[PDB]
């Protein structure tokens, strides 16, 4: 009976193994655009992926997720409202079932056809499994996705889907390069949050670009044909893998733009 988005295990019975779930720092959160405080002080976002290199492919029964080498700094995160490096060890996406929902994070109240978590660790705890525990931890670059054209540079990640259809599949998946993922502007909000899947432990800067992607209804259409189960198994499919809004307590959410 592992945690999931089904009716007997979804995210309002997380708190039972993860109590933190009620925690103080939860994520993800509506962003009020109208009571989020711009801040001058907050820098650009400095994101440098020309040196990345993706490495595989999986389907972890919940998401799929695109690793990349993190030994060096090769695709790095720093500025805004970060103090030191980043390094890109994965990225992940969520969904919906319907073009109306499947973003975690929502705006005004305004859910998205899905949500993009770049995910990166802060290079001085030496390794990802050390940033997790500490406050300053992890920072998520979160890009929203809108049904309309679509996106070239995603079409290599939805051509490999098939490859990697059910729970614990993965694949080689290289030289797949992350700025083709990428908005034309980077103005962002950014508010201290947690990971929005167990453990849900409260480590991450959040960084949400305020510009959506487009993507095309069939390039959607083929992430919904995954599945959390595993070969052999029933088949359930993956969608609506998004964590609903989380009360957002004693945070203030900060935007780098007026
Ligand atoms: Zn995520």
Request: glycine share 8%; aromatic share 10%.
């Amino acid at each position: 009976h592992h945690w999931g988005y089904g009716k007997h295990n979804g995210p309002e019975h997380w708190h039972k193994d993860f109590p933190i779930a009620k925690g103080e720092r939860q994520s993800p959160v509506d962003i009020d655009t109208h009571t989020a405080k711009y801040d001058p002080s907050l820098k650009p976002l400095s994101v440098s992926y020309d040196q990345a290199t993706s490495l595989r492919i999986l389907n972890n029964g919940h998401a799929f997720n695109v690793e990349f080498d993190d030994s060096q700094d090769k695709a790095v995160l720093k500025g805004g409202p970060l103090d030191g490096t980043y390094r890109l060890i994965q990225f992940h996406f969520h969904w919906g079932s319907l073009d109306g929902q499947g973003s975690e994070h929502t705006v005004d109240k305004k859910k998205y056809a899905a949500e993009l978590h770049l995910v990166h660790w802060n290079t001085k705890y030496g390794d990802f499994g050390k940033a997790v525990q500490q406050p300053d931890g992890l920072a998520v670059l979160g890009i929203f996705l809108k049904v309309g054209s679509a996106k070239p540079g995603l079409q290599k990640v939805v051509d490999v889907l098939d490859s990697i259809k059910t729970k614990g599949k993965s694949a080689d998946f290289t030289n797949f390069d992350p700025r083709g993922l990428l908005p034309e502007s980077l103005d962002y909000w950014t508010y201290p949050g947690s990971l929005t899947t167990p453990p849900l432990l409260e480590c991450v800067t959040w960084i949400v670009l305020k510009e959506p992607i487009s993507v095309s209804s069939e390039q959607v259409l083929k992430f919904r044909k995954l599945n959390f189960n595993g070969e052999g198994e029933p088949e359930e499919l993956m969608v609506d893998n998004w964590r609903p809004a989380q009360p957002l307590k004693n945070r203030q959410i900060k935007a780098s733009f007026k």
